[PDB]
């Protein structure tokens, strides 16, 4: 038996369950970088305004094309002069990039880049990269000031704000990231941007990791498609931050429906559902660097997610980033050290009334546990409930229009968490948000069954979240607090504690 619970066909998914959308427009809480009066199916969006407007502030992105990006001396014009040379070898790209990054000439290794070029790529491919792709990338990179003509706000901690943007605009930005043109983004001592993730792609060219080329394949697949064929969709990046959370002890809301399976993945089989990304608080994690786990894979196969790093400040405990409309340009076999680029992916997902694809991804960072038992402390249980709930909550949205949540072993690989606790927590969080849950256990068939049995057990006995929470609190005190290893595990205890009275 490959799955358990309520069948996946009965779960709500977009666009079916979606609300009627209000007309897209700019507001104090919503930056829209395109012309909404023109927005139209299968036609590349027009940027608003028509001509570049610059801001060099602590409130907006610092664009490379700004007349205030200086090295007098226009670094932008330095960047143009550098990239407009012809690249016949890897070192020409190294030198080019290092022309406007002279402080890092002996700190940025480019060995991975040369290996992908000379060894892993065959001559017919290597030729295609420097004759078609690279010069095509440079054109869209230098078109930035004609395409990203509206300053881009930074999504800082505590801001509840959305930025909606064209896929074409995303492309030009990411192109700039590749060639490492974003100023004041590379220091260590750092100024402004210590609390923001890396955006420049320098670390992607470092060292002798065997995975490094496969990432380069994955991003070039994306850089190929959008250069050869411009995409026409919009993407929304929404930072959400709550100041008030459910009193979990006294919450009276019932548990929702579950579908659990050890077959499939969030991206593959959570189509048109709220797909959870298991983030680092610096969203995207080490996608640019040496990370190649769930989030980073997701950021690579949906490379438009990466740009979020340009403007999304590290998430606080009460925050998440919702991304709606990113497109999948690659497929993958493997995981981490076994990850391979396998195939260009043709996405056939329906776009909504704002021309965003009906893919909604939410980044929520679990906590990272040194030790096992630390997670059962109420504080930590409460934190994770709050993070997930924020992840799932759509304030002012009727539940009958919320899709189900496609999630899995959140926090339970790199971050040391317990799958059986975190499953339950997300089940508690989703119930508070009145959403249904589709759980992917990622091969673990015993976990599928334990979560099923648990959910099934709790539903029978008509326990509201408050009662299921109070049990988790009871587990800590009676069995975790005074513990050489806790005597009974979480699930056997709940079965005992419920049946014992
Ligand atoms: N495509 C998938 N679909 C469903 N489930 C998956 C998938 N991929 C992995 N899993 C399961 O989900 C588990 C998650 O293990 P993890 O990917 O490490 O996320 P974390 O919260 O533990 O740690 C995230 C950190 O690592 C990153 O660098 C971030 O930036 C953070 O810094 C796997 O063991 C799988 O069972």
Total number of domains constituting the chain: 1
Q: What is the CB-side half-sphere exposure of residue 206 using CA atoms within 13 A?
A: 15
* Whether residue 410 has its Cβ less than 6 Å from ligand 1: yes
Q: Which of 198, 296, 319, 352 is catalytic?
A: 296
Q: Which of 214, 295, 327, 365 is catalytic?
A: 295
Query: With contact defined as beta carbons under 8 Å apart, do 450 and 256 qualify?
Result: no
List, comma-separated, the residues after which the chain is broken, a break being a C to N distance over 2.5 A; otherwise answer none. Answer: 71, 483
Query: With contact defined as beta carbons under 8 Å apart, do 298 and 170 qualify?
Result: no
Is 296 among the catalytic positions? yes
| β-sheet bridge partners, residue 323 | 237, 361
* Whether residue 334 has its Cβ less than 6 Å from ligand 1: no
Give Cα 204 distance to the centre of its chain. 18
- With the most atoms of ligand 1 within 8 angstroms of its CB, the residue from 274, 276, 294 to mutate is 294
Q: Which atom of ligand 1 is nearest to the CA of 416?
A: 22
* Whether residue 414 has its Cβ less than 6 Å from ligand 1: yes
Residue nearest ligand 1's atom 12 by CA: 409
- Judged on CB neighbours under 10 Å (0-12, 13-18, 19+), 59 is exposed
Query: With contact defined as beta carbons under 8 Å apart, do 259 and 8 qualify?
Result: yes
- With the most atoms of ligand 1 within 8 angstroms of its CB, the residue from 215, 259, 278 to mutate is 278
- Judged on CB neighbours under 10 Å (0-12, 13-18, 19+), 85 is middle
Query: What's this structure's resolution in Å?
Result: 2.4
- With the most atoms of ligand 1 within 8 angstroms of its CB, the residue from 264, 290, 380, 413 to mutate is 413
Method: X-ray
* 307 vs 143: CA distance, rounded Å: 17
Contacts of 466 (CB under 8 A, 6+ apart): 248, 249, 250, 251, 252
Q: What is residue 47's DSSP assignment?
A: B
Residue nearest ligand 1's atom 8 by CA: 294
Tell me the torsion sign for CA atoms 492, 497, 498, 501. Answer: positive
Interhelix angle for 75-83 vs 90-99, to 10°?
Answer: 170
Centre of ligand 1 from the C-alpha of residue 410, in Å: 6
Centre of ligand 1 from the C-alpha of residue 298, in Å: 10
Residue nearest ligand 1's atom 4 by CA: 265
Structural domain span for residue 444: 1-501
412 is in an annotated binding site: yes
Distance, first Cα to last Cα, the chain: 33
Contacts of 299 (CB under 8 A, 6+ apart): 277, 284, 285, 287, 305, 306
Q: Three-state SS for 18?
A: coil
- Judged on CB neighbours under 10 Å (0-12, 13-18, 19+), 253 is middle
């Amino acid at each position: 038996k490959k799955w358990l619970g309520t069948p996946i066909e009965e779960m709500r998914k977009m666009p079916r369950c979606g609300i009627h959308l209000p007309s897209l427009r700019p507001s104090a809480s919503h930056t829209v970088t395109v012309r909404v009066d023109l927005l139209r199916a299968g036609e590349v969006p027009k940027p608003f305004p028509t001509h570049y407007k610059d801001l060099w502030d602590n409130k907006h992105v610092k664009m490379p094309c700004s007349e205030q990006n200086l090295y007098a001396g226009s670094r932008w014009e330095l960047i143009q002069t550098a990239l407009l040379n012809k690249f016949t070898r890897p070192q020409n790209l190294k030198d080019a990039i290092l022309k406007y990054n002279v402080a890092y000439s002996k700190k940025w290794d480019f060995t991975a880049l040369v290996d992908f070029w000379d060894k892993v790529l065959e001559e017919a491919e290597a030729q295609h990269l420097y004759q078609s792709i690279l010069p095509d990338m440079v054109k869209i990179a230098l078109c930035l000031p004609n395409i990203c003509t509206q300053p881009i706000p930074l999504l800082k901690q505590k801001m509840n704000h959305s930025v909606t943007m064209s896929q074409e605009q995303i492309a030009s930005l990411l192109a700039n990231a590749f060639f490492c043109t974003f100023p004041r983004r590379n220091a260590k001592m750092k100024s402004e941007y210590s609390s923001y993730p890396d955006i420049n792609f320098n670390r992607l060219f470092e060292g002798r990791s065997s995975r490094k080329p496969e990432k380069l394949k994955t991003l070039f697949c994306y850089f190929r498609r959008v250069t050869e064929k411009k995409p026409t969709g919009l993407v929304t990046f929404t930072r959400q931050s709550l100041e008030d959370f459910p009193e979990w002890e006294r919450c009276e809301k019932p548990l929702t429906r579950l579908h659990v399976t050890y077959e499939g993945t969030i991206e593959g089989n959570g189509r048109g559902m709220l797909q959870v990304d298991f983030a680092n608080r610096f969203v995207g994690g080490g996608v640019t660097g040496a990370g190649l786990v769930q989030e980073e894979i997701r950021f690579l196969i949906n490379p438009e997610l990466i740009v979020s790093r340009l403007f999304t400040e590290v998430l606080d405990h009460n925050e998440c980033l919702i991304i709606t409309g990113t497109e999948q340009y690659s497929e993958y076999t493997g995981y981490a050290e076994t990850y391979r680029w396998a195939r260009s992916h043709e996405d056939g997902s329906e776009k909504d009334d704002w021309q965003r694809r009906c893919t909604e991804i939410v980044a929520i960072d679990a906590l990272h546990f040194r030790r096992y038992l630390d997670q059962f402390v109420p504080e930590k249980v409460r934190r994770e409930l709050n993070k997930a709930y924020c992840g799932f909550l759509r304030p002012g949205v009727p539940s009958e229009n919320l899709s189900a949540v496609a999630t899995g072993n959140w926090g339970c690989g790199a971050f040391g968490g317990d799958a059986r606790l975190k499953a339950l927590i997300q089940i508690l969080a989703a119930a508070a948000a009145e959403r249904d849950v589709v759980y992917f256990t990622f091969g673990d068939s015993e976990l599928m069954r334990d979560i099923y049995s648990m959910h099934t057990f709790l539903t029978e006995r008509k326990l509201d979240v408050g009662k299921v929470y109070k049990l988790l609190l009871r587990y800590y005190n009676e069995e975790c607090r005074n513990c050489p290893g806790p005597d009974i595990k979480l699930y056997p205890f709940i079965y005992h504690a419920v049946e014992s009275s």
